[PDB]
Amino acid sequence: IETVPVKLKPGMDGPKVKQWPLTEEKIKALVEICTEMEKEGKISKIGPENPYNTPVFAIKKKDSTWRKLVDFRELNKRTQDFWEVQLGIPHPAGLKKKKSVTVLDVGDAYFSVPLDEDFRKYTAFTIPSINNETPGIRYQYNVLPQGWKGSPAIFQSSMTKILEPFKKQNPDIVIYQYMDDLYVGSDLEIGQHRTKIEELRQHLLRWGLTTPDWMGYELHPDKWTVQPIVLPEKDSWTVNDIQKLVGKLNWASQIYPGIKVRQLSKLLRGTKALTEVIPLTEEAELELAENREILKEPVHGVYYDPSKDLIAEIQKQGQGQWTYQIYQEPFKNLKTGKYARMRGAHTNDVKQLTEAVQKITTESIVIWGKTPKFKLPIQKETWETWWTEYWQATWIPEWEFVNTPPLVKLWYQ
Amino acid sequence: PISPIETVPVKLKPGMDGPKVKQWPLTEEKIKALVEICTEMEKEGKISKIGPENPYNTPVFAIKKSTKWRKLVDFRELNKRTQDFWEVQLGIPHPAGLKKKKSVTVLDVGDAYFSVPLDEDFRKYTAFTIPSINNETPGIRYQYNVLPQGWKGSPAIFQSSMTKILEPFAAQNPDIVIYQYMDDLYVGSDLEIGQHRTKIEELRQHLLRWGLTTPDKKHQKEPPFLWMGYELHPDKWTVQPIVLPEKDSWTVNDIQKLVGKLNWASQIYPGIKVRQLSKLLRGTKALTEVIPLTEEAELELAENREILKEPVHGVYYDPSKDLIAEIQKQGQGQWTYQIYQEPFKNLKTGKYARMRGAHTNDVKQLTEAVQKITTESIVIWGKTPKFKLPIQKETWETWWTEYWQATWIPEWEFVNTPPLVKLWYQLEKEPIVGAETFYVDGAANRETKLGKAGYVTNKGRQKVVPLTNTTNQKTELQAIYLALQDSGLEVNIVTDSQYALGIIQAQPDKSESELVNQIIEQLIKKEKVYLAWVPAHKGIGGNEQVDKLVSA
Numbered sequence: 014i015e016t017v018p019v020k021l022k023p024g025m026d027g028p029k030v031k032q033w034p035l036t037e038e039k040i041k042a043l044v045e046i047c048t049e050m051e052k053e054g055k056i057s058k059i060g061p062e063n064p065y066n067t068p069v070f071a072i073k074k075k076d077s078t079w080r081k082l083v084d085f086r087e088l089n090k091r092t093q094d095f096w097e098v099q100l101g102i103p104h105p106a107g108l109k110k111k112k113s114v115t116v117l118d119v120g121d122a123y124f125s126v127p128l129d130e131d132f133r134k135y136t137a138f139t140i141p142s143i144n145n146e147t148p149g150i151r152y153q154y155n156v157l158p159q160g161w162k163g164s165p166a167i168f169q170s171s172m173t174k175i176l177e178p179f180k181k182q183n184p185d186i187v188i189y190q191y192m193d194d195l196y197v198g199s200d201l202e203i204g205q206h207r208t209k210i211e212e213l214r215q216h217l218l219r220w221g222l223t224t225p226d227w228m229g230y231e232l233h234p235d236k237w238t239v240q241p242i243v244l245p246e247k248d249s250w251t252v253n254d255i256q257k258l259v260g261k262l263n264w265a266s267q268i269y270p271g272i273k274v275r276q277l278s279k280l281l282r283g284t285k286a287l288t289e290v291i292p293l294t295e296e297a298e299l300e301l302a303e304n305r306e307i308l309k310e311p312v313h314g315v316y317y318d319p320s321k322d323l324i325a326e327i328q329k330q331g332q333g334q335w336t337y338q339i340y341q342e343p344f345k346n347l348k349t350g351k352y353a354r355m356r357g358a359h360t361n362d363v364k365q366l367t368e369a370v371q372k373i374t375t376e377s378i379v380i381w382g383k384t385p386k387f388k389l390p391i392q393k394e395t396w397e398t399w400w401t402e403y404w405q406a407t408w409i410p411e412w413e414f415v416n417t418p419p420l421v422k423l424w425y426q
Numbered sequence: 427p428i429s430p431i432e433t434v435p436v437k438l439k440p441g442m443d444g445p446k447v448k449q450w451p452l453t454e455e456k457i458k459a460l461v462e463i464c465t466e467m468e469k470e471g472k473i474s475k476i477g478p479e480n481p482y483n484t485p486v487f488a489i490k491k492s493t494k495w496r497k498l499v500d501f502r503e504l505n506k507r508t509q510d511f512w513e514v515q516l517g518i519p520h521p522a523g524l525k526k527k528k529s530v531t532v533l534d535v536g537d538a539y540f541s542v543p544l545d546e547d548f549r550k551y552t553a554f555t556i557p558s559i560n561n562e563t564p565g566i567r568y569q570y571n572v573l574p575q576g577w578k579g580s581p582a583i584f585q586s587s588m589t590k591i592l593e594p595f596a597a598q599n600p601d602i603v604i605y606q607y608m609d610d611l612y613v614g615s616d617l618e619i620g621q622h623r624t625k626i627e628e629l630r631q632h633l634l635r636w637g638l639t640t641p642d643k644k645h646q647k648e649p650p651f652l653w654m655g656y657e658l659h660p661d662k663w664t665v666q667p668i669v670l671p672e673k674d675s676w677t678v679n680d681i682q683k684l685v686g687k688l689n690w691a692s693q694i695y696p697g698i699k700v701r702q703l704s705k706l707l708r709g710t711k712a713l714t715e716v717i718p719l720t721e722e723a724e725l726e727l728a729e730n731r732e733i734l735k736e737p738v739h740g741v742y743y744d745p746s747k748d749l750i751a752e753i754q755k756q757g758q759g760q761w762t763y764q765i766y767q768e769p770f771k772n773l774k775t776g777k778y779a780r781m782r783g784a785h786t787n788d789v790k791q792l793t794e795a796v797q798k799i800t801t802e803s804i805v806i807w808g809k810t811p812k813f814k815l816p817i818q819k820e821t822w823e824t825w826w827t828e829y830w831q832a833t834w835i836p837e838w839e840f841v842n843t844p845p846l847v848k849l850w851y852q853l854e855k856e857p858i859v860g861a862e863t864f865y866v867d868g869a870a871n872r873e874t875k876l877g878k879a880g881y882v883t884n885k886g887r888q889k890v891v892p893l894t895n896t897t898n899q900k901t902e903l904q905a906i907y908l909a910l911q912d913s914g915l916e917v918n919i920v921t922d923s924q925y926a927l928g929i930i931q932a933q934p935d936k937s938e939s940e941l942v943n944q945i946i947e948q949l950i951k952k953e954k955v956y957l958a959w960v961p962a963h964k965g966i967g968g969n970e971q972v973d974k975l976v977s978a
């Protein structure tokens with residue numbers, strides 16, 4: 014009943030972000046959602062003296078019939094030192110090492126805490142109308158809104174208190190909170206681990222805190238690694254195959270110092286046809302084997318800089334496959350990976366890319382407690398019109414749109 | 427008279443005080459006109475005399491056209507100190523998204539702003555002074571009690587006040603559609619004309635009880651309603667008349683205005699083109715500079731005059747029927763589309779002509795056009811249209827499977843109307859056995875721009891071409907062009923240029939570079955081409971041989 018005073022960062026005004034146009038079915042769903050939220054006092058209508066706005070979308074975690082997702086990305090940047098410095102939620106480095114990690118949505122708890130009365134005007138949002146036929150429906154939040162990085166910072170003391178009996182009861186379980194999500198990691202058998210999650214759900218339910226109802230929200234970060242680069246093993250090398258191989262190793266030497274290609278180049282002397290078969294000499298085979306032993310070792314000197322942003326690049330590999338790498342400085346990868354899923358009838362590109370972004374973002378949160386900024390291989394307008402069709406997360410990472418193709422496609426196959 | 431309308435609380439920007447601009451003297455006949463106008467505004471409660479403790483002021487002028495003077499207050503300094511408001515009427519509806527109505531009435535809210543009160547605590551900042559004659563006596567001090575004309579917050583507050591006044595009427599009459607724009611009201615309904623005119627009168631009376639006056643049925647406007655450059659009938663719409671001038675000479679201003687009018691007309695008039703006319707605006711921003719119309723620009727303008735020769739109208743939206751969009755290629759990277767529910771009547775038309783960069787292909791541009799239409803449809807009708815496209819399924823399926831970017835394609839139908847969208851050539855995925863292997867390379871001097879482009883083949887053929895006014899990039903493209911000129915219908919080409927590899931693997935069929943076009947012409951004539959890449963200066967077989975030739 015007593016509100017925590019909240020302030021923007023010094024010298025910054027509130028967000029004024031355009032509301033994206035929405036289909037008719039999503040406007041209706043948003044109108045039904047907000048009519049209830051206003052009856053429940055969570056949000057109230059505002060007037061023209063509130064110039065701020067934050068975009069809203071309608072997404073769909075599988076259920077009977079629609080949830081409201083607010084893109085607080087701008088408001089989060091403009092309230093940053095309030096939530097990252099004053100009430101920052103530290104990051105445990107052991108969460109990435111547990112055998113199983115389950116993710117639980119606790120965002121419903123925020124709705125019981127009132128929001129600082131002088132801060133509510135910054136949570137203003139608009140439900141658009143079809144073809145601008147009527148002015149937007151303008152609301153602002155009265156309670157802590159989901160997706161705002163200040164809601165967990167305020168609810169943190171209440172969350173530590175609710176979780177305290179569970180942690181003393183289970184001293185080995187790692188619990189980390191990122192926004193509206195709890196990440197719970199254990200080293201238990203998957204059957205015992207799911208029982209412990211149900212126990213924790215019953216603990217939160219007993220203290221009045223509702224939650225959901227081999228994959229899904231269940232992870233296994235002990236099986237994740239940084240992925241290795243691999244060279245093909247062939248019995249017959251053509252001139253073209255060797256040229257592919259010297260090209261890849263020349264690109265690899267940009268990351269690994271000790272790569273050598275001299276013995277392989279000397280096999281291609283004197284203007285050969287591309288399809289000519291070249292048997293590998295003993296000296297090139299040993300050159301090839303020594304390079305294979307260099308790529309099985311991690312690149313050394315790669316460290317995470319908490320002062321820098323994380324960058325995530327994605328490559329479309331075809332055959333429903335996608336490769337990604339997370340870095341802060343070019344060619345010093347902190348993690349690389351691959352994504353693939355195979356249901357021809359239901360599946361398409363934007364679909365795969367959207368699920369890849371959410372997967373990479375979840376891996377990022379588990380490991381560094383921070384989302385990356387994505388270099389998305391897609392047209393800007395195409396992504397902006399369809400990403401909400403398959404978004405099932407409560408957060409939204411930063412993204413930008415890459416317009417040049419890379420030849421490094423096959424270099425990551 | 428206290429107004430029954432709830433005032434909106436207004437604040438000044440933080441750390442700013444109200445305006446303190448002193449009033450310049452005006453002529454005696456202006457002052458006499460100001461005293462007469464203000465005394466009538468004071469009687470109507472729109473202003474009020476204030477004491478001397480108010481330290482603020484804003485200049486006032488007076489000017490006439492009728493036989494009446496008008497009062498003008500220059501609120502520029504107060505606007506700079508006024509808070510920001512929720513942006514007003516930024517997006518207007520597109521008439522193609524409205525639904526047909528039997529009757530539509532326009533209502534001009536006369537004296538709109540002065541009928542809405544102003545926040546009491548904020549009125550002190552609107553103080554102004556009528557100067558006494560020869561500045562010998564104290565000036566007459568007034569301040570506003572309503573929304574002043576030209577103040578930063580008057581449009582936002584009035585529209586907000588108007589909506590709150592309208593919402594009980596609309597709640598009682600869900601069979602009535604109202605759209606507000608500035609101080610106008612467009613009221614449409616499907617009721618029989620008798621009871622529709624009754625609802626209009628009920629609305630006028632409802633508005634009148636809050637101090638909002640509206641034109642009598644006598645002075646109520648009639649079709650059509652000139653609004654935002656459109657002409658609106660209850661059952662059809664079009665753009666206002668487009669007049670393209672005949673001129674002996676054309677400046678940048680004249681052609682910028684011309685492209686604007688042609689763009690505006692393209693939303694209903696099908697086939698408008700603006701590629702050649704917009705090419706003339708490249709790079710130059712001198713408004714009065716005369717640009718000579720090219721041969722292609724003259725033809726394009728001629729083609730548009732023929733399209734604009736007789737009127738075209740658009741039909742309104744029927745939500746009960748499917749939305750269909752069809753696209754045709756015009757050539758030179760130009761496309762046009764129509765959105766319709768029924769034949770012979772279009773909801774709207776439009777064009778997509780942009781090249782994203784220097785090179786594209788038809789399948790990519792078609793996808794970008796479908797994207798532009800999908801965005802436009804969601805804004806106007808809240809949904810995605812069914813597409814009819816001049817591309818066969820096998821053509822698109824092989825493109826979006828192998829295109830390096832992610833993309834989404836809606837449900838669509840193939841329309842056989844030529845010209846069809848096709849893949850003009852496809853590079854081989856594996857090297858061609860029995861086909862000659864060309865090791866191409868190029869080089870140029872960055873100062874003299876003198877270059878060389880040549881090749882060495884496995885068969886022993888070698889060639890070198892001298893090049894002037896070129897770059898290392900162009901030479902690498904000239905080298906591939908050379909190997910395509912001198913090879914059979916099947917050829918393996920090995921380059922060291924990542925640049926040239928990225929261009930050709932993008933499989934373009936259109937380009938702004940003449941050289942790339944010539945390479946496209948050669949790739950079409952070939953039967954099988956394999957393009958391979960190796961690192962430069964790594965001892966890689968034939969590449970080191972051709973590198974030594976053109977380096978010299």
Ligand SMILES: Cc1ccnc2c1NC(=O)c1cccnc1N2C1CC1
Pocket residue numbers: 146519524525526527530603604605612613614615651653658659660661
């Ligand atoms: C300018 C404008 C903007 C938005 N809607 C409308 C209009 N004006 C019309 O005349 C109109 C014509 C046909 C259908 N709706 C119309 N109306 C609506 C109110 C019935």
Ligand SMILES: O=C(O)Cc1cc(=O)oc2c(O)c(O)ccc12
Pocket residue numbers: 867868869902922923924925961962963973
């Ligand atoms: O690879 C480089 O270092 C730049 C480079 C690019 C290229 O397309 O062609 C090159 C070339 O023909 C050279 O002789 C040297 C360097 C390059």
Ligand SMILES: [Mn+2]
Pocket residue numbers: 867868902922923962
């Ligand atoms: Mn080269």
Ligand SMILES: [Mn+2]
Pocket residue numbers: 867868869922962973
């Ligand atoms: Mn070279």
